[PDB]
Short mmCIF file of C-alpha atoms in Angstrom, two decimals:
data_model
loop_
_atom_site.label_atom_id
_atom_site.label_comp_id
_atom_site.label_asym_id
_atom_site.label_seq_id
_atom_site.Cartn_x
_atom_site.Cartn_y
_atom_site.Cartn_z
CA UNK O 101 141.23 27.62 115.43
CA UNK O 102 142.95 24.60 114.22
CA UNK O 103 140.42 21.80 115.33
CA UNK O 104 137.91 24.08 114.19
CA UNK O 105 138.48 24.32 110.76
CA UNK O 106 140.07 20.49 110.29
CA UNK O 107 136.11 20.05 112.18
CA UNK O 108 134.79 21.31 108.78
CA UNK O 109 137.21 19.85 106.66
CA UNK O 110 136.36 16.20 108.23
CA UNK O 111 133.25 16.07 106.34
CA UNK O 112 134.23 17.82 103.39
CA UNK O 113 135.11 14.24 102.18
CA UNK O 114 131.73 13.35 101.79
CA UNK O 115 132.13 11.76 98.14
CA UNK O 116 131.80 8.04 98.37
CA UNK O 117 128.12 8.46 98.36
CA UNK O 118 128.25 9.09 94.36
CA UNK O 119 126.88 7.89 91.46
CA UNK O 125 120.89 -1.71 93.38
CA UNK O 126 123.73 -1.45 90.37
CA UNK O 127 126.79 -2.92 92.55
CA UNK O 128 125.72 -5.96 94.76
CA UNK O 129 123.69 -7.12 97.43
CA UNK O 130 124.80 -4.11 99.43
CA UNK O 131 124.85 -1.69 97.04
CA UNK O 132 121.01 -1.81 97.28
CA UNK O 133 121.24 -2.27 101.27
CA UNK O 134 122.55 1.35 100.86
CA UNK O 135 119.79 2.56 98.29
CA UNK O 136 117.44 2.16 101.13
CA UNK O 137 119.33 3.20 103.99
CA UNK O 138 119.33 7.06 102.76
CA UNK O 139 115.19 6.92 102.35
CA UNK O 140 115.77 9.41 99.26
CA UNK O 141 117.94 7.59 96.71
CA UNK O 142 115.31 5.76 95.14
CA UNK O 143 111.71 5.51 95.02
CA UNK O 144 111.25 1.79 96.59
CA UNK O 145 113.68 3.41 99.16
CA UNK O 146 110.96 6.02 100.32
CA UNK O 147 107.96 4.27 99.54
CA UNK O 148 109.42 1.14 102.45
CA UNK O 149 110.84 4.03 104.73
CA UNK M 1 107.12 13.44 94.51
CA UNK M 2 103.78 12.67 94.51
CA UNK M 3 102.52 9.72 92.73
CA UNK M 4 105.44 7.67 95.17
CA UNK M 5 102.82 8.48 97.98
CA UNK M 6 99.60 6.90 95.67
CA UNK M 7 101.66 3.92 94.90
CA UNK M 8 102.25 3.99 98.68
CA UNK M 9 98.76 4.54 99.92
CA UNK M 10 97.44 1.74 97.47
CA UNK M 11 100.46 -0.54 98.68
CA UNK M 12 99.15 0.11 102.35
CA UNK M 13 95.51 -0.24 101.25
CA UNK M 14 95.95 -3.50 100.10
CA UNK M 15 97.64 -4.54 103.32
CA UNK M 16 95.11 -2.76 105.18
CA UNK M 17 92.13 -5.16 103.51
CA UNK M 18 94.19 -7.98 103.68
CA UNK M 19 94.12 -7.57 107.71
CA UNK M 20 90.41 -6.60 107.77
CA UNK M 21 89.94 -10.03 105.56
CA UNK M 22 92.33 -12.23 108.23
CA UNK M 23 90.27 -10.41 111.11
CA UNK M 24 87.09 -11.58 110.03
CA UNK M 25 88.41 -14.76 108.37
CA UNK M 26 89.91 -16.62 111.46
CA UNK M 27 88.11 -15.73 114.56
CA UNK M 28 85.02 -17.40 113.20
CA UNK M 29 83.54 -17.09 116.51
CA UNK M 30 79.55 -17.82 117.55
CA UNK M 31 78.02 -17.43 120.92
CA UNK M 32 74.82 -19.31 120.67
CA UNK M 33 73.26 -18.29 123.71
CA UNK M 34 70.26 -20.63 124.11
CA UNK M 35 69.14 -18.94 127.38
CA UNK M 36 66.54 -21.38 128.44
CA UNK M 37 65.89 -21.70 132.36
CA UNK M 38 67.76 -24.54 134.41
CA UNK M 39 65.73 -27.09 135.42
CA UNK M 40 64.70 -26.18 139.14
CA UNK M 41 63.32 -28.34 141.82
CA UNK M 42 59.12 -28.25 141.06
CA UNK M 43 60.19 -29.11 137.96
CA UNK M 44 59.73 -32.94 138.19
CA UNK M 45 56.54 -32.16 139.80
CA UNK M 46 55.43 -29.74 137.22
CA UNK M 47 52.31 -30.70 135.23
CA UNK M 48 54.09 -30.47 132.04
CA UNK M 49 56.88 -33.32 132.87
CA UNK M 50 54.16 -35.54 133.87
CA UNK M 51 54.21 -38.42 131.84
#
């Protein structure tokens, strides 16, 4: 019961991913999720 | 969510053309068949080589 509930708590940290406005990286992450931003989608 | 696909399918368009412009731009290719008979042996005795 234990692994199973820490199993949903794992992801329940799932904040980092919060609000091209950073660095180089920061847009190398815009178009890694194909949804943050429309040159993002539009290459995907 | 919409207009993102015209930009898209003009984006794509443009690259298509481009292509069909490089595919008929550098293989300028011509046969120029010029399928006249070999000369065969009566030739030289022919009437119309007789100088």
């Amino acid at each position: 019961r234990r692994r199973e509930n820490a199993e949903r708590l794992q992801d329940d940290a799932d904040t980092d991913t919060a609000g091209t406005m950073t660095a180089r990286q920061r847009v190398w992450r815009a178009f890694e999720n194909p949804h943050t931003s429309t040159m993002a989608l539009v290459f995907y | 969510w919409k207009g993102i696909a015209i930009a898209l399918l003009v984006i794509l368009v443009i690259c298509s053309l481009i292509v069909t412009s490089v595919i008929l731009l550098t293989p300028a290719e011509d046969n120029s068949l010029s399928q006249k008979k070999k000369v065969t042996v009566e030739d030289l005795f022919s009437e119309d080589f007789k100088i």
